[PDB]
Design a protein around this ligand. Structure first.
Ligand SMILES: Cc1c(-c2nc3c(-c4ccc5c(c4)CCC[C@H]5NC(=O)c4nc(C(C)(C)C)no4)ccnc3[nH]2)cnn1C1CCOCC1
Length: 265
């Protein structure tokens, strides 16, 4: 579980997030890694460390791999697989890629495989969104930072009325009662498909968080991105049923996405 930080060589800053700075570097002079330098006061560290033992065992080709942690001194480090093309959201926003719809659906499949694996292990992501997926040098999309939301100390992130809370990715039962389940990840995944087909537009871009919560409680939904076929829109919409138990599983979504790939090759 433990990595010796002296085996790390730091090379470039990648960005700053909920837990502070993240860097790109090498492990033992040779292996690409991303290193989260956890900003003091920003994480429930003891709980996270206990949980990292479980997370180490979540291994899937479409999940960013946790390699280990450096706990001896602070800041603590989280060491992970490095993704050369950065976050899916910024990748979608670079219009130069001029992705074909088949590539867009492959991105959704990549995420849906990861989530189906997590669902099979009864492990929630809790903050699924394009900003929390990453792209490797082969253009493969992987799911990042699953479950880490549980260790954030910042009330602006955790409170449902907080400035940083993922309101636009949340189902009504989440906004109304904090009922979190595999079905809240499903809802978020549909929003994520919408992000992908919308090339990274903000969901409900003309509404505030408050306005979004009220409209989805009334039954308003996102609508079809121009790049989504009717079949693709159907899949994303299915994630948004008002009743959580009527939303599909990731296993079902996966077969649906595979069928659509077969029908719109
Ligand atoms: C950014 C970039 C990468 C690149 N980044 C990475 C990162 C990575 C992951 C997260 C994050 C960053 C980097 C950074 C900030 C957000 C941050 N989020 C968190 O830490 C965080 N959130 C959460 C919750 C709130 C969901 C619970 N928990 O933890 C990891 C691996 N491989 C990478 N590869 C490659 N190129 N680039 C540009 C591309 C063009 O410009 C140069 C760098």
């Amino acid at each position: 579980w433990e990595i010796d930080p002296k085996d790390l060589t730091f090379l470039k800053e990648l960005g700053t997030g909920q837990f502070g700075v993240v860097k790109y570097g090498k492990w033992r002079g040779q292996y690409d890694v991303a290193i989260k330098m956890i900003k003091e006061g920003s994480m429930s560290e003891d709980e996270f460390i206990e949980e990292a033992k479980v997370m180490m065992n979540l291994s899937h080709e479409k999940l960013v791999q946790l390699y280990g942690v450096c706990t001896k001194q602070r800041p603590i480090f989280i060491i992970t697989e490095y993704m050369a093309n950065g976050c899916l959201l910024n990748y979608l926003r670079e219009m130069r890629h001029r992705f074909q719809t088949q590539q867009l659906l492959e991105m959704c499949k990549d995420v849906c495989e990861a989530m189906e694996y997590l669902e099979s292990k009864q492990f929630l992501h809790r903050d699924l969104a394009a900003r929390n997926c990453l792209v490797n040098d082969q253009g493969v999309v992987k799911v990042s930072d699953f479950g880490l939301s549980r260790y954030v100390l910042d009330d602006e992130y955790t409170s449902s009325v907080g400035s940083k809370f993922p309101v636009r990715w949340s189902p009504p039962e989440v906004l109304m009662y904090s009922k979190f389940s595999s079905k809240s990840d499903i809802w978020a995944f549909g929003v994520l498909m919408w992000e992908i087909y919308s090339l990274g537009k903000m969901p409900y871009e003309r509404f505030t968080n408050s306005e979004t919560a009220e409209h989805i409680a009334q039954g308003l939904r996102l609508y079809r991105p121009h790049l989504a076929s009717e079949k693709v829109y159907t899949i994303m919409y299915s994630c948004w049923h008002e009743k959580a138990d009527e939303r599909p599983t990731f296993k079902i979504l996966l077969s649906n996405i595979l069928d659509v790939m077969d029908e719109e090759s």
